[PDB]
Amino acid sequence: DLIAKLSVNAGEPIGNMRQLHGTSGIPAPAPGTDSVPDILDVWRNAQVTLVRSYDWVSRLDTIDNPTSLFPDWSADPSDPASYNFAATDTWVGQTRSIGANILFTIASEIPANKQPARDLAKYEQVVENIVRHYVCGWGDGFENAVSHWEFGDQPDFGKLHFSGTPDQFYEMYAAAARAVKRVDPALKVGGPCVAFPLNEGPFREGFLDYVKQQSVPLDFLSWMWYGDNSRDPMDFRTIAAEVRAIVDKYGFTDTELLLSYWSMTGIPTAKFEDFDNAAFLAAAAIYMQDSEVDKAIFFRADTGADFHYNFTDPAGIFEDDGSQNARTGAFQLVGQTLATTERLAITGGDDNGFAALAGRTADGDTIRILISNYAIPDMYLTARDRDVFEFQVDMSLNVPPRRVDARSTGYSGYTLEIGHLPWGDGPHRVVRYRADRDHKGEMLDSHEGRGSSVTVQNKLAVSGVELIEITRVS
């Protein structure tokens, strides 16, 4: 029995906690998409802070399409009646009602249609009034509902998401950026959602070169990463460092890095245990808290019901019927930890999958200590002959060298000493929540005590996630 030894100083912040708990997916029914469960309250309890809109039925299709935001491209682009906002309005309102911001992805109806825009001038006008609808109340719209506007989704994923040329993609990006900034310079615009971020190409170097040479705004560079071929929660930090270096190389030192998709698996035939995945995503969140990632979108916090490809994506962490499990439990405990504002020092975790993170709320009355015990499986600790991952859709991408020395320490439990509780030595409450092979994030036990220090110990086998919550008792 190997027992990890953790210590937290609860009385002094080391710095600000960074709110990286973004996600994508459909949280509740909307007109025309009413078959999905209502899980919006779970997003609220998880303290989701950012929602990518791409998986909604909220596409700006480049041909005529009833479900598109502009369904008839012959219609008057100045008339609100020409726009189809109803379902998107519902999802925007749902997202704002839980206090989350929106990353609105401007994209065609992938995969049914990936053609570029036929009429760039009209495309630009239509993008601008979509923005005005969600930012300036245009056409019975919202005020300041969408802070981030993304153009693109995996243009380098073969021709499966974009069938135009790179030049056509770049001009479309510039039109969208012009329209967003014309509505409100304070809005953030970016792209292109690189699918293969360690691969040179027209949508990495060629995209950065274009926005530089043509002086196009780029508030964030967006990209994706999945753990399919590593199962290593460290990957997101590793990739972000490399992306940061390439973006800086083009002079874009103020541009943020936005992780538009991240998941243990992104291959639609991937197989995994619920509890392994839960521990992975908690460890990944902890590791990327110290990284070049500035904003992150977990893929995907719903049932995986995909109304574009018309299947159930296994990356959807909820059960088909909306019910909960270890993944949804870990998702909530992570978000609650990331919602603290003052990060606290925790010492004794490691970089081989026993990840720990501590923080306290702004009012000082709640300490949260998040612990994931995750083990990279043995078969993923073998170095590859060649650091390229090949998969069927036949495609290939560059992957980082595997961390062959990152085998789990194999802890079976932990003891945790929290000192200097900030409200003093009076009454406090200790509550523990667990997501593992037997639990879905619910509370396991609790007690009340006194003193400015508290010691907590538990068995916590690999593939388990635990949240320790310490509160002042009134």
Residue numbers in the entry: 4 to 396, 404 to 484
Publication text:
A putative open reading frame of 1458 bp (cmgh1), encoding a protein of 485 aa (CmGH1) with a theoretical molecular weight of 53.48 kDa and pI of 4.66, was identified from the whole-genome of strain C. marinus E4A9T. According to the phylogenetic tree, the protein CmGH1 belongs to the GH39 family. Here, we present the characterizations and crystal structure of CmGH1, which showed β-glucosidase activity, instead of β-xylosidase activity, to provide a structural basis for the development, and utilization of the marine sourced β-glucosidase. Therefore, CmGH1 was evaluated for saccharification potential with different substrates, which turned out that CmGH1 showed β-glucosidase activity when using p-nitrophenyl-β-D-glucopyranoside (p-NPG) and cellobiose as substrates.
